[PDB]
Amino acid sequence: SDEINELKEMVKDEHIYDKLVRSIAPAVFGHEAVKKGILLQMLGGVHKSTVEGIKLRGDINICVVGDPSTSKSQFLKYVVGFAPRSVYTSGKASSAAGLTAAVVRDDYTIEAGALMLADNGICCIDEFDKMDISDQVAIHEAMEQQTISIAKAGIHATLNARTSILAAANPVGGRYNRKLSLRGNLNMTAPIMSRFDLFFVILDDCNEKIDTELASHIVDLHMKPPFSAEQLRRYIKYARTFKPILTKEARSYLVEKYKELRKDDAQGFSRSSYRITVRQLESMIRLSEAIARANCVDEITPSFIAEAYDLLRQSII
């Protein structure tokens, strides 16, 4: 009875966007863009079923790359302990088969992997770089089609796994190199990179003021927030109740901005789109739906698509 009035005073705030991007992960110092992306993962898009029977992904997949002391795993713990239907896993290995369904002699039966346990939820994966090749080719179907198909011995099935992926991958060979491209620092190939919605590069820079503020902040959580956790959960679920719809000017701005995105990724003579695909177009429509859910509105303005393109322009470099 009081919570609906509290929700009403949330949705009429003038600076909803800043409050929601600051309320995500209050223990973690800094990285407001990563908090914004994690918030958009909690909101997400809407699942669409085409009349031709073709399914379109409504989930959002973040990859976070950073130095070995950058609190990527702290973001993972926050999302696991905060969001419902969330599963923490290690990408390298697990008990029996991790992230994949396995056949068990008992006549074979299915053990669900960590992707399946995060049904309609978030699967936070740590050490995503050294994951197995079977896990690689199962993720290659698991992000977009949201199904894992297992045909082994006498048992064959398809298994629906509606899962939004948050991954934290260290760069191989040491820290992140600022001179190299973002593709060079990671062990992932082209298609599984294009399957991710957005990327976040975080660096452990060495300055006096930032280190002193960070150290005083992290000792200030040891025996010393715009929204509370239940308040954040209620507002996020209320944003999940919204299903936004597009306007014609939004379609015109999206096709022109996809033209602008498609022009800028030219690899010289080859005329090859190495990173920008149609998956970036579905990424922009999903982020526009998530931002329209963030302001609790039923329509997507072209400014929302501009903010989504700003997010992809931040992730592209």
Binding site: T50, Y258, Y274
Partner: protein, 89 residues
């Protein structure tokens, strides 16, 4: 046992390195060998080439499909079937 499996096999593969090279032949583009390639009747090669106008019509089609397939767009089932047929015509 000699079972019957009269199967039409539709496969979806990727080129070597993740992208197809237009200047290279088909043999080292794939990791497949000659016999597994030889049974396949039609081998459709798709190249993601950047175009100023094909991307425009493709983007308009995909955005219109995402608009059209949204859930928020005499009985309930009869009018549901009628509007689904009107949507798919």
């Amino acid at each position: 046992t000699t079972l019957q499996a009269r199967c039409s096999i539709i496969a979806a593969a990727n080129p070597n390195g993740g992208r197809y090279n237009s200047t290279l032949p088909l043999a080292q583009n794939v990791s497949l060998t000659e016999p597994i390639l030889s049974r396949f009747d039609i081998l459709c090669v798709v190249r993601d080439l950047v175009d100023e106008e094909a991307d425009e019509r493709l983007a308009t089609f995909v955005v219109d499909s995402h608009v059209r397939s949204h859930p928020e767009n005499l009985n309930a089932r009869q009018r549901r079937l009628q509007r689904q047929r009107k949507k798919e015509e």
